[PDB]
Design a protein around this ligand. Structure first.
Ligand SMILES: CCCCCCCCCCCCCCCCCC(=O)OC[C@H](COP(=O)([O-])OCC(O)COP(=O)([O-])OC[C@@H](COC(=O)CCCCCCCCCCCCCCCCC)OC(=O)CCCCCCCCCCCCCCCCC)OC(=O)CCCCCCCCCCCCCCCCC
Ligand SMILES: CCCCC/C=C/C/C=C/C/C=C\C/C=C\CCCC(=O)O[C@H](COC(=O)CCCCCCCCCCCCCCCCC)COP(=O)(O)O[C@@H]1[C@H](O)[C@H](O)[C@@H](O)[C@H](O)[C@H]1O
Ligand SMILES: CCCCC/C=C/C/C=C/C/C=C\C/C=C\CCCC(=O)O[C@H](COC(=O)CCCCCCCCCCCCCCCCC)COP(=O)(O)O[C@@H]1[C@H](O)[C@H](O)[C@@H](O)[C@H](O)[C@H]1O
Ligand SMILES: CCCCC/C=C\C/C=C\CCCCCCCC(=O)O[C@H](COC(=O)CCCCCCCCCCCCCCC)COP(=O)([O-])OCC[N+](C)(C)C
Ligand SMILES: CCCCCCCCCCCCCCCCCC(=O)OC[C@H](COP(=O)(O)OCCN)OC(=O)CCCCCCCCCCCCCCCCC
Ligand SMILES: CCCCCCCCCCCCCCCCCC(=O)OC[C@H](COP(=O)(O)OCCN)OC(=O)CCCCCCCCCCCCCCCCC
Ligand SMILES: CCCCCCCCCCCCCCCCCC(=O)OC[C@H](COP(=O)(O)OCCN)OC(=O)CCCCCCCCCCCCCCCCC
Lengths: 76, 57, 183, 89, 469, 171, 318, 86, 108
């Protein structure tokens, strides 16, 4: 029979145990931990080495901050 | 003694590939699909009688 | 074409009728069956007003989960119930005939800002005036309603979604706090 | 505001004036929350904002978790007893 | 750092066994102690009643709220130091007062729900936080499932809290209908003149107030308090009261309110005359909860009630807490024990307690004189500082009925002493086992605060002056 | 800014522009032509459109009544661009918006008549497509070769015209 | 007017036919799986089986509520047919929130299982109806959660928007485990026998069963596999046709509906093919399979998708 | 080898859906006058399609093109009234 | 009169017709349960209802870039600990008495 050794009685041996005997909780928790841990370590490597971020889209009509120089043309 | 998890010849990843991808389910699916493509055993009763012996009663 | 005009006041009358069939029924399942009728009359009103998204959220969770929940409870449980007899419920009638008047009129009082107490009520009914709908061409992408809810729950009110996590957490812990009998 | 006030007042008096079973209390409580929603969502439409709809999408959730909690409370009440009484708890 | 506790302990309690529950509660107790010790330097943030609005016009952090925020952790240490610690090491005392597996989770979820009201600015934080704490009371009540009274009590509390939650949501929706904003400072003292808001703001008040025991609807709460076990009820009598009363007192939405003044008078009447002919101890004790929670709608009528409120709340919380812990001590000496969940039920049962030990009756005498406002005690200056604000702002009949209510109430406070100093006929000569050390040191400390808080009264007034003005 | 009702009832008003606002030459182009000519009326009439939205900004609430002068001039110059593109490249303009009237008016589906129209207008009418806000080392999307998103059916007349423009060498 | 009533006539009549020919297709293919002739034939005369037993099924005995649940089960099974598109932009009613509708009707489909157990009640039969209900809702969870993780790449509740997004690559080939678990959740909504403890007016449950079979086949076909998409076919047309004409729109609508129907027909054959090969579940195994093992994987796939969209720019724009 | 009687039902189901979808695309192209449908319609696009109906005259999406507007285009502009929504 | 609405008017007519032909052609004429059965449906609701809290994010995923991401991640990560509560506590598993408790035979 295969019993619980404990996470505290050897970590790496426990992960090796849980990979065999409970793969529905190893390969489910290990596929969901590979997301927020890879988001903190693989993003600046991309922004430096693959391609930087995109330019943001406009959301409304882009108003400038000028003071209306007087236009000439299309009077009548 | 029944061998533990650590006296097993295959890896946990190799075992999990059989665990999640249903390795022997597709095998038994394939067997019934093999039976789909062969010529059936069925006979017409009112126009054919099955094989009989002379000593039949 | 003005057959298609009274559609809101119709569903109002149907909701009145449907609650009369909630609180006057023989079986305990007949009441929840008129209740899912009430949810779908509501969802028709919510589509009617201009909110197509909500009506389908009401179908998803109100004739969705909590319906099935109540139908389920009434199945696998026995519940004694009497009928709406006159000998046990006519004694409540002169209180109901007061509280109907008072609670409806007072629930129609606070939409007004005068200080007369008769001009307050008469602004609830004195609204037969047709709002004028102009076209402004300022919006460029189809940020519909659900996009803006997902923008406000996630940036401006992220804490309400994040306390909400604790509430749904509690809705998971609670039934396991009660109905388990560990060991 | 008529349909919301009517569901609220009539559901409220359906809560108050029962003596026959326990589930009519639960379902009248649930239709009161519906009646509050019917007033809030139209004030969202007529004022042109989502923030009444923000409180709507929050109170949907709180009505849900309310039902989950309260029906586990009922199964607590039923486990120890035999049959939920007609007159009430 | 509540949620840093809750998220951690819920995984910790999920895996621990049923025997480990005591030591789990001991861990959480020491954790709350060190959150109060190592992190209580955040008083420096305010120095002149400086208020912060955090999470974007959603929470409101000022110093009134910091004091309530500190008070709730302190009383939770005293409550959790009860479930952690054995009273005696006997067979009876193990089968009595057993903590359930999920109880320590629901306490801290309730404290999250109670703190997010006193810190609350928006109505949606108000509504989500009254819901979080109302669920937690639904489940702290019902967690002793194998009790007939506790299950009936949780089912009653469910529907009454549900009606008052829909009444609050109706008031919130209605204020939204007359004004676009949800925050209370969209009022900013120009609305209220030019706008009939009195009916909305009272219905918002009365929605929370009826959840607490405002006296036309006092009958259901007394029944729930008498029906729960004697340790659920010290928590579920303290927490929702102080949490929403410091909400309604921080945000003065009902000034000069005539409905609030009537119901304040009706509370002071029916509490002090309801507790008169009552034979059960949790009853007597809950109407002492009712009159004292009706020296609260009074300050809620006022403007600028932050000396009277805060002083009276920490007075009341210490006094409350101490007298429940006194009768939890008193159950060893009584002759008859019924009803495993609720071991002492009648105030007739704690007779002759002075002949058993005298110092527990010395403790009981100082707390019961602190409830009735006896002047060298800390409970006196609470009523003194209510009356320096009631009369300050024009409530003269309120003051006379306050006095008459205090006098009628003292008649059933002193019944506890009339019972407890009498001849018993069966005196104790030698107890073999003694009560737990820390759990009696907590009551000794809570006494010496009550009897010697007038020492530090003057320091508190000067500190107060700096930090709220 | 609002989506219509339960029962909305349409109405018009047989009336006139009263006294002091002169008559104007309004755009009589449907969705396909002005979606086709959008970049070119955005390229010529940039400061007039800018000036109109600025004037609408500065008169807060005055708004509609204030800049009648000036939404008069964005219409005139947009009508000027589309008359010029008519008389310039009516055939290839027409090819582009007969393409773009299928495919949900998705711009994605009609690169082929587009590039032909852009050569024609950049030659005769010397206006150019730009996607602004686009920092360098980012290719504009209507220039790239082998895009991921290709249409369902390349329409026939632009296949033929693009092949003949290849053969003539004008492209 | 006439323009749209002829249109809904053609669609209703085609779907009503196809659901009836499935009841023949299942008998035939399970016959040849086990080397029997099964039903005699399948032709135009071939409906007269399913017609004839659909007639005779209305001749047995039954022993106001009993009226309503077969009715609402069949109309819930029949209203979900609008929202599937059969070609580009071809819907019987066009609505921007089609997945929200499809999802709400997968939510409405549970009620007949409740109200069927009330009729001719016993204690044990009522308990069995409870078990069928709870497995139905339990797999409805994972159904809805994968609908979310499909429309994470779309960020739109419109369905033709999904398939036009899908033009570059089908969603089935990156998210292949998702196809596998959807196929089993799809034979879980229905009572197909790997998943059929709780089976082992009747004409409405009989019709609505197969209507749900072919309709959840449709729900697979548009969001996981290509809906009406087979290949690009831009080059073949420029050789065949010269210009847009009603023949050309006919030929393209024909090949689009062929590419949709081949998805639906192969998936529908695979339902009957997974029927034959496997025995059925203990109900404890059913609930255990749904919650303890498959759904933690579902949270994991749910966390790994936005993080993958996060690592690159790659957020989808509405 | 392959059974034909097993594959004729699925052939009929396939052919039914095929002929259905072909008829559907022809009906949509006949309603719109030779152009394909708009599957995803913005608020912007809905206002624009209403303006096109107002411009071309009566017909749905005729998609006419002109250097200016007609004089009737200035006067035919509509506002939508809307009931009280009680 | 669009083509969406005849369908959802016309189907209840089809059901009523298939029902009236059945009324024309037919022949006519508490036990205790386990806690797992009640708990599946009671606990189903807080897992169906986070899904609809997840529905507004999936539509607006582009706008809340880099920030609504982390809010949703934290929301889900608060939900996973209540999930691991119920799977640590063996909540859905139903048990029986088939074991003989495997006690060794002790003599004298
Ligand atoms: C990155 C590298 C890759 C990721 C790491 C890979 C491994 C991930 C951890 C594996 C989970 C541990 C585990 O045992 O497996 C499953 C575990 C099962 O354990 P078990 O062996 O079955 O227990 C059976 C025993 O009988 C029962 O034995 P037990 O009674 O001893 O209990 C076992 C233990 C099992 O749980 C654990 O052992 C996990 C504890 C890890 C906690 C910390 C993890 C997060 C690390 C963050 C790192 C930050 C730096 C990152 C910087 C990046 C910069 C780019 O449970 C507990 O004791 C309670 C949890 C205590 C958590 C305390 C958390 C709060 C303090 C830490 C955060 C402090 C932040 C302060 C900031 C706030 C200031 C206001 O499953 C769970 O119970 C859920 C885990 C919940 C995690 C939280
Ligand atoms: C739960 C189920 C939910 C149910 C929902 C259905 C209905 C809900 C509404 C009820 C909600 C709950 C009701 C709670 C009680 C209502 C509270 C209430 O009375 O405020 C009234 C509003 O004065 C009306 O104008 C009150 C007049 C109201 C109109 C009377 C009703 C008409 C009946 C016709 C017969 C006033 O208060 P207040 O003491 O601050 O007002 C005082 C006082 O008016 C002045 O003299 C003072 O000078 C001033 O300082 C001011 O403070
Ligand atoms: C919170 C504490 C206060 C609540 C009310 C607040 C008052 C304001 C602040 C008060 C400041 C409090 C400071 C802590 C005081 C520290 C302190 O005196 O030693 C402790 C009390 O230790 C707590 O009881 C520790 C108190 C509770 C903390 C529990 C975790 C430690 C005195 O026990 P003790 O010698 O009689 O205990 C004896 C002694 O240890 C040995 O003879 C035996 O082993 C034992 O059986 C027992 O007979
Ligand atoms: C070494 C620790 C060992 C473990 C002990 C664990 C817990 C101990 C908890 C409480 C002990 C009592 C401390 C009271 C602090 C009051 C602060 C304050 O008067 O509040 C004032 C305002 O109050 C008010 O409006 C009125 C409150 C009225 C109180 C009425 C009862 C008082 C009478 C007895 C209390 C004083 C007894 C002193 C005993 C030596 C605000 O000032 P503040 O917020 O900056 O003060 C906190 C600064 N801090 C965090 C560094 C300490
Ligand atoms: C790559 C390295 C990281 C891999 C770490 C894997 C740890 C495996 C966890 C584990 O051991 O699960 C098995 C164990 C079961 O406990 P057991 O002894 O069998 O008795 C109770 C059974 N119910 O433990 C359990 O009780 C299961 C509890 C965990 C269940 C996890 C499934 C929930 C979904 C997780 C989503 C991913 C969350 C990742 C965190 C994201 C933030 C960093
Ligand atoms: C049961 C009633 C619940 C109503 C459910 C609403 C169903 C729905 O989603 O309607 C959507 C549809 C239009 O929605 P939309 O996405 O904006 O369409 C885009 C057009 N290109 O809407 C439609 O096209 C027609 C709406 C059909 C709903 C009929 C309800 C009428 C209620 C009348 C009350 C009579 C009593
Ligand atoms: C990339 C990193 C990670 C690598 C791993 C890959 C993970 C991604 C893959 C995810 C897809 C998961 C698919 C579903 C998982 C099924 C889990 C399973 O099969 O076993 C668990 C369960 C029994 O639980 P347990 O107690 O542990 O049993 C031990 C017996 N070995 O078993 C059961 O209870 C039932 C087992 C059968 C399930 C029902 C079968 C349905 C039949 C359909 C089969 C497919 C048919 C396809 C048809 C078309 C084929 C052309």
């Amino acid at each position: 029979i295969n019993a619980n050794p404990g996470f505290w009685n050897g970590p790496f041996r426990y992960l090796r145990w849980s990979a065999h005997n409970r793969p529905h909780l190893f390969f489910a928790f290990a596929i969901g931990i590979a997301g927020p841990v890879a988001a903190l370590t693989l993003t600046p490597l991309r922004r430096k080495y693959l391609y930087p971020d995109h330019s943001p889209l406009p959301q409304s009509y882009p108003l400038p901050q000028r003071a209306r120089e007087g236009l000439t043309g299309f009077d009548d | 003694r029944p061998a533990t998890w650590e006296e097993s010849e295959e890896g946990a990843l190799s075992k999990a590939t059989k665990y999640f991808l249903l390795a022997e389910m597709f095998r038994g699916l394939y067997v019934v699909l093999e039976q789909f493509f062969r010529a059936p055993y069925t006979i017409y009763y009112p126009f054919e009688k099955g094989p009989v012996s002379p000593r039949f009663r | 074409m003005y057959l298609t005009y009274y559609f809101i006041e119709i569903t109002i009358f149907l909701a009145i009728l449907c609650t009369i069939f909630i609180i006057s029924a023989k079986n305990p399942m007949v009441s929840i069956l008129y209740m899912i009728a009430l949810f779908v009359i509501a969802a028709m009103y919510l589509y009617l007003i201009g909110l197509g998204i909500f009506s389908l959220l009401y179908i998803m969770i109100y004739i969705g989960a909590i319906a099935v929940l109540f139908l389920f409870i009434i199945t696998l449980l026995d519940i004694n119930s009497t009928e709406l007899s006159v000998k046990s419920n006519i004694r409540d009638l002169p209180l109901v005939l007061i509280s109907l008047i008072v609670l409806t009129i007072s629930g129609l009082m606070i939409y007004s800002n005068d200080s007369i107490l008769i001009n307050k009520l008469l602004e609830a009914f004195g609204n037969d005036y047709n709002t004028i709908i102009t076209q402004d061409w300022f919006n460029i992408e189809n940020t519909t309603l659900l996009t803006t809810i997902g923008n406000v729950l996630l940036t401006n009110n992220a804490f309400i979604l994040l306390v909400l996590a604790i509430v749904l957490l509690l809705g998971i812990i609670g039934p396991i706090s009660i109905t388990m009998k560990h060991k | 505001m008529f349909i919301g006030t009517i569901i609220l007042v009539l559901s409220f008096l359906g809560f108050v004036f029962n003596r026959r079973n326990i589930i009519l209390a639960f379902i009248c409580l649930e239709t009161m929350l519906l009646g509050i929603n019917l007033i809030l969502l139209r004030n969202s439409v007529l004022f042109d904002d989502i923030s009444g709809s923000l409180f709507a999408i929050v109170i949907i959730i709180l009505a849900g978790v309310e039902s989950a909690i309260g029906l586990s409370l009922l199964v607590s009440y039923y486990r120890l007893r035999g049959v939920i009484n007609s007159y009430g708890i | 750092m509540l949620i840093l506790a809750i998220i951690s302990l819920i995984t910790f309690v999920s895996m621990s066994k049923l025997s480990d529950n005591r030591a789990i509660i001991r861990l959480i107790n020491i954790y709350l102690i060190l959150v109060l010790v190592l992190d209580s330097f955040l008083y420096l943030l305010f120095l002149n009643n400086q208020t912060y609005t955090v999470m974007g016009e959603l929470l409101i952090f000022n110093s009134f709220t910091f004091y309530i925020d500190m008070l709730i952790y302190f009383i939770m240490i005293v409550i959790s130091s009860l479930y952690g610690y054995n009273l005696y090491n006997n067979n009876l005392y193990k089968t009595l007062f057993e903590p359930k597996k999920e109880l320590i989770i629901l306490f801290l979820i309730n404290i999250l729900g109670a703190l997010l009201i006193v810190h609350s600015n928006d109505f949606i934080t108000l509504f989500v936080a009254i819901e979080l704490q109302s669920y937690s009371i639904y489940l702290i009540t019902a967690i002793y499932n194998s009790s007939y009274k506790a299950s009936k009590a949780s089912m009653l509390y469910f529907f009454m809290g549900g009606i008052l939650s829909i009444l609050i949501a109706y008031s919130i929706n209605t204020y939204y209908s007359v004004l676009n904003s949800y925050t209370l400072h969209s009022l900013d003292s120009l609305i209220i003149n030019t706008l009939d808001l009195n009916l909305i703001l009272i219905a918002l008040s009365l929605g929370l107030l009826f959840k607490i025991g405002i006296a036309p609807l006092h009958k259901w709460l007394i029944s729930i308090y008498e029906n729960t076990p004697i340790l659920i009820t010290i928590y579920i009598s303290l927490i929702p009261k102080i949490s929403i009363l410091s909400y309604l007192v921080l945000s003065n939405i009902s000034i000069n309110s005539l409905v609030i003044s009537i119901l304040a008078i009706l509370t002071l009447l029916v509490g002090s005359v309801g507790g008169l002919l009552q034979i059960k101890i949790k009853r007597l004790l809950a109407f002492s909860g009712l009159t004292n929670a009706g020296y609260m709608m009074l300050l809620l009528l006022l403007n600028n009630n932050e000396f009277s409120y805060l002083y009276y709340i920490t007075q009341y919380s210490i006094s409350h807490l101490a007298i429940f812990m006194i009768i939890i001590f008193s159950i060893y000496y009584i002759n008859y024990i019924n009803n495993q969940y609720n071991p002492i039920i009648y105030v007739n049962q704690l007779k002759g307690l002075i002949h058993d030990n005298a110092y527990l009756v010395l403790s009981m005498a100082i707390v019961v004189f602190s409830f009735i406002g006896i002047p060298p005690l800390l409970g006196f200056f609470g009523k003194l500082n209510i009356l320096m604000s009631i009369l300050n702002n024009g409530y003269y009949f309120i003051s006379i009925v306050l006095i008459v209510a205090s006098l009628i109430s003292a008649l059933y406070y002193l019944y506890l002493l009339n019972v407890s100093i009498q001849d018993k006929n069966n005196i104790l000569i030698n107890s073999n086992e003694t009560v737990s050390s820390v759990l009696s040191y907590i009551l000794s400390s809570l006494i010496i605060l009550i009897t010697f808080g007038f020492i530090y009264n003057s320091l508190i007034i000067d500190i107060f002056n700096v930090y709220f003005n | 800014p609002r989506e219509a009702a339960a029962h909305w009832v349409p109405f018009e008003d047989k009336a006139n522009m009263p006294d002091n606002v002169p008559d104007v030459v309004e755009v009589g182009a449907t969705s396909a032509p002005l979606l086709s000519a959008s970049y070119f009326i955005g390229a010529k009439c940039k400061p007039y459109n800018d000036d109109f939205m600025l004037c609408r900004e500065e008169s807060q609430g005055s708004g509609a009544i204030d800049c009648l002068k000036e939404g008069r001039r964005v219409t005139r110059c947009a009508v000027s661009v589309i008359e010029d593109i008519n008389k310039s490249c009516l055939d290839e303009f027409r090819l582009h918006w007969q393409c773009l009237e299928q495919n949900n008016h998705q711009l994605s589906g009609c690169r082929k008549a587009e590039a032909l129209l852009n050569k024609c207008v950049f030659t005769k009418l010397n206006l150019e497509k730009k996607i602004p806000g686009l920092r360098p080392d980012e290719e504009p999307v209507f220039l790239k070769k082998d895009p991921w998103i290709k249409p369902a059916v390349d329409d026939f007349k632009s296949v033929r015209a693009y092949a003949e423009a290849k053969k003539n060498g004008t492209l | 007017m006439i323009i749209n009533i002829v249109e809904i006539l053609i669609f209703l009549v085609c779907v009503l036919f196809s659901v009836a020919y499935l009841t023949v297709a299942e008998r035939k293919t399970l016959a040849y799986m086990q080397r029997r002739l099964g039903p005699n034939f399948v032709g135009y005369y071939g409906l007269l089986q399913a017609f004839a037993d659909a007639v005779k099924l209305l001749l047995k005995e039954i022993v106001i509520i009993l009226v309503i649940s077969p009715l609402i089960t069949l109309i819930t099974a029949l209203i979900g047919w609008v929202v599937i598109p059969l070609g580009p932009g071809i819907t019987l009613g066009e609505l921007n929130l089609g997945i929200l509708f499809s999802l709400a009707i997968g939510s409405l489909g549970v009620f007949g299982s409740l109200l069927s157990g009330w009729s001719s009640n016993s204690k044990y039969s009522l308990l069995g109806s409870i078990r069928s209900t709870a497995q139905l809702i339990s797999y409805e969870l994972i159904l809805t959660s994968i609908f979310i993780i499909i429309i994470m790449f779309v960020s739109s509740l419109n369905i033709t928007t999904i398939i036009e997004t899908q033009r570059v690559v089908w969603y089935c080939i990156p998210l292949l485990p998702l196809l596998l678990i959807f196929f089993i959740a799809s034979v879980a909504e229905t009572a197909r026998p790997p998943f059929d403890l709780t089976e082992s007016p009747f004409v409405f449950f009989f019709l609505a069963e197969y209507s749900n079979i072919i309709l959840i086949s449709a729900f697979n076909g548009y969001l996981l596999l290509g809906g009406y998409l087979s290949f690009n076919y831009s080059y073949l047309f420029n050789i065949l046709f010269n210009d847009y004409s009603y023949v050309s729109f006919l030929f393209e609508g024909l090949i689009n509906s062929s590419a949709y129907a081949i998805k639906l027909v192969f998936l529908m054959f695979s339902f009957i093919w997974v029927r034959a090969a496997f025995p059925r579940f203990t109900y404890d195994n059913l609930i255990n399979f749904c919650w303890i093992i498959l759904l933690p994987l579902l949270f994991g796939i749910f966390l790994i998708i936005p993080s993958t969209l996060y690592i690159f720019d790659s957020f989808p724009t509405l | 080898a392959i059974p034909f009687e097993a594959l004729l039902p699925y052939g009929i189901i396939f052919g039914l859906l095929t002929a259905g979808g072909g008829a559907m695309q022809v009906l949509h192209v006949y309603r719109n006058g030779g152009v394909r449908d708009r599957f995803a319609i913005d608020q912007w696009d809905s206002q624009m399609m209403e303006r096109d109906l107002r411009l071309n005259g009566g017909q749905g999406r005729k998609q006419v093109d002109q250097a200016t507007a007609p004089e009737a285009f200035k006067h035919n502009h509509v506002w939508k009234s809307e009931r009280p929504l009680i | 009169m669009n083509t969406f609405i005849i369908f959802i008017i016309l189907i209840p007519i089809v059901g009523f017709a298939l029902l009236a032909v059945n009324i024309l052609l037919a022949v006519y004429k508490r036990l205790a349960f386990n806690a797992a059965f009640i708990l599946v449906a009671i606990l189903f609701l807080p897992f169906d209802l986070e899904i609809s809290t997840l529905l507004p994010y999936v539509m607006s995923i582009y706008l809340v870039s880099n920030y609504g991401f982390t809010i949703v991640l934290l929301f889900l990560l608060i939900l996973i600990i209540g999930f691991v509560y119920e799977i640590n506590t063996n909540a859905l598993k139903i048990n029986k008495h088939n074991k003989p408790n495997t006690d060794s035979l002790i003599y004298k």
